[PDB]
């Protein structure tokens, strides 16, 4: 019917990607709710959620490049290098983010609990992203 | 021509996606970055340039080339996509510089950061232009 083979494959790949993204976003929402109503505030949870959403969007764009080389290849070649350079410079940022996520998950101390962290004692106000 | 059904469908889909995104944003502000409508425009422009390249190939294999070597359209579309990407990156740099300036920072540091980012983008352009 004058239909070039490949349209069905494109549709199925797009649908699979959409389902994967929806599941990832549901997981992000569950994680954000757990962080919020466990020990964390709202601003940090929202920031973490939107960071995860941006990361998923970036991974989608990177994987979507298998269709056209003039749509994402002309931009992915720079985005990947910039992200790698930032991660190399920002390694401490990711380390702090992971440590904060662990502190929210495992609760050695809660807000309003007098603690001593390496010679610096005082009441804990809130655990933020970094 | 009716033969380019795939190109017609892709262009119509890109246009419909842009229109729907505009309608959604009018009813409610888009989440994450405001750059969502800029990324949507970038992707639609990439799709349009791919369709234009396909139609040029069809014309060259069907219609007279008018002594035009195939590739000029591809070069033009790639250059236009790069220009749009650079404009969006520069707008993001300007937003970041304004935020740094009128948040806690002075003007000299903000200007230096902005021009450093501009130089980095120019370098990435030169590297990709090779
Ligand atoms: C409201 C806070 C917005 C921050 C969203 C995440 C930004 C990630 C930038 C990554 C640069 C390497
Ligand atoms: C209940 C167990 C949850 C464990 C999931 C951890 C997810 C870490 C998110 C990392 C964000 C960059
Ligand atoms: C009190 C709930 C504890 C949940 C901890 C789950 C273990 C996460 C392992 C992460 C490995 C990177
Ligand atoms: C007025 C300050 C000009 C500095 C502009 C950035 C220079 C970057 C040089 C990078 C060398 C590796
Ligand atoms: C509101 C969130 C803004 C986050 C963007 C960070 C950009 C870092 C610039 C790095 C310059 C080399």
Kindly provide the resolution of this structure in angstroms, with one decimal: 2.8
CA of B67 to the centre of ligand 4 (A): 46
Contact state of B50 with A71 under an 8 Å Cβ cutoff: yes
CA of A51 to the centre of ligand 1 (A): 6
Half-sphere exposure of A66 (CA within 13 A, CB side): 9
In whole angstroms, what is the distance from residue A10 CA to residue B4 CA?
17
In whole angstroms, what is the distance from residue A97 CA to residue A94 CA?
5
In whole angstroms, what is the distance from residue A108 CA to residue A93 CA?
21
Give the single-character DSSP code of A119.
Answer: S
Would an 8 Å CB–CB cutoff place A75 in contact with chain B? yes
Q: Please answer whether residues B89 and B121 qualify as being in contact, where contact means their C-beta atoms are separated by less than 8 angstroms.
A: yes
Longest dimension (CA), chain A: 76
In whole angstroms, what is the distance from residue B41 CA to residue B37 CA?
6
Can you tell me which residue has the tokens 């007098």?
A: A114
Would an 8 Å CB–CB cutoff place A71 in contact with chain B? yes
Phi, psi of B28 (to 5 degrees): -145, 140
Distance of CA B117 to CAs A124, B89, B92, Å? 38, 9, 10
Phi, psi of A67 (to 5 degrees): -95, -55
Q: Which long-range contacts (CB under 8 A, 24 or more apart) does A49-52 make?
A: A50/B31, A50/B32, A52/A28
Burial class (CB in 10 A: 0-12, 13-18, 19+), A3: exposed
Half-sphere exposure of B52 (CA within 13 A, CB side): 16
**Joined tokens for residue A110:** 């809660």
Can you tell me which residue has the tokens 């973490």?
A: A48
Give CA torsion, residues B7, B8, B11, B16, to 10 deg.
-150
Half-sphere exposure of A112 (CA within 13 A, CB side): 2
Technique employed here was: cryo-EM
Residue B56 gets the label, from left (phi > 0), alpha (psi -120 to 50) or beta, of alpha
Q: Please answer whether residues B1 and B54 qualify as being in contact, where contact means their C-beta atoms are separated by less than 8 angstroms.
A: no
**Joined tokens for residue A26:** 């549901």
What DSSP string runs through A5-22?
TTHHHHHHHHHHHHHHHH
Which of A2, A3, A70 has its CB closest to that of B50?
Answer: A70
Residues 89-118 of B with CB under 8 A from A: none
Per-residue exposure over B18-42, b if at least 16 CB sit within 10 Å of its own CB, e if not = beebeeeeeeeeeeeeeebebebbb
In whole angstroms, what is the distance from residue A105 CA to residue A121 CA?
22
Helices (H), A37-110: 42-64, 73-89, 91-105
- For the Cβ of A18 lying below 6 angstroms from any atom of ligand 3, the answer is no
**Joined tokens for residue A39:** 């020990």
In whole angstroms, what is the distance from residue A108 CA to residue A110 CA?
7
Using DSSP, state whether B63 is helix, strand or coil.
coil
Contact state of B46 with A70 under an 8 Å Cβ cutoff: yes
Using DSSP, state whether A55 is helix, strand or coil.
helix
Q: Please answer whether residues A81 and A95 qualify as being in contact, where contact means their C-beta atoms are separated by less than 8 angstroms.
A: no
What size, in residues, is chain B? 130
Nearest C-alpha to atom 1 of ligand 5 is from which residue? B96
């Amino acid at each position: 019917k004058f239909i070039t083979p490949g349209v069905i494959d494109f549709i199925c790949t797009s649908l699979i990607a959409v389902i994967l993204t929806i599941k990832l976003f549901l997981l992000i929402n569950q994680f954000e709710k757990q962080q919020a109503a466990k020990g964390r505030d709202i601003t940090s949870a929202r920031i973490m959620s939107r960071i995860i959403k941006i990361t998923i969007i970036v991974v989608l764009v990177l994987l979507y490049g298998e269709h056209f080389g003039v749509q994402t290849a002309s931009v992915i070649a720079v985005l990947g290098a910039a992200g790698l350079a930032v991660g190399l410079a920002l390694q401490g940022s990711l380390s702090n983010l992971a440590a904060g996520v662990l502190l929210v998950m495992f609760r050695p101390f809660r807000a309003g609990e007098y603690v001593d962290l390496g010679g610096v004692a005082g009441t804990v106000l809130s655990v933020q992203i970094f | 021509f009716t033969n380019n059904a795939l190109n017609l469908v892709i262009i119509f889909g890109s246009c419909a996606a842009l229109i729907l995104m505009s309608f959604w944003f009018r009813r409610g502000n888009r989440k994450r970055k405001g750059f969502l409508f800029h990324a949507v425009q970038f992707l639609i422009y990439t799709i349009i340039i791919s369709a234009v390249g396909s139609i040029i190939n069809y014309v060259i294999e069907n219609y007279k080339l008018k002594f035009i070597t195939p590739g000029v359209i591809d070069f033009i579309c790639t250059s236009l996509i790069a220009v749009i990407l650079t404009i969006k990156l520069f707008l993001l740099i300007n937003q970041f510089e304004k935020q740094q300036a009128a948040k806690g920072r002075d003007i000299t540091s903000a200007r230096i950061m902005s021009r450093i980012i501009k130089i980095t983008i120019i370098v990435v352009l030169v590297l990709l232009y090779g």
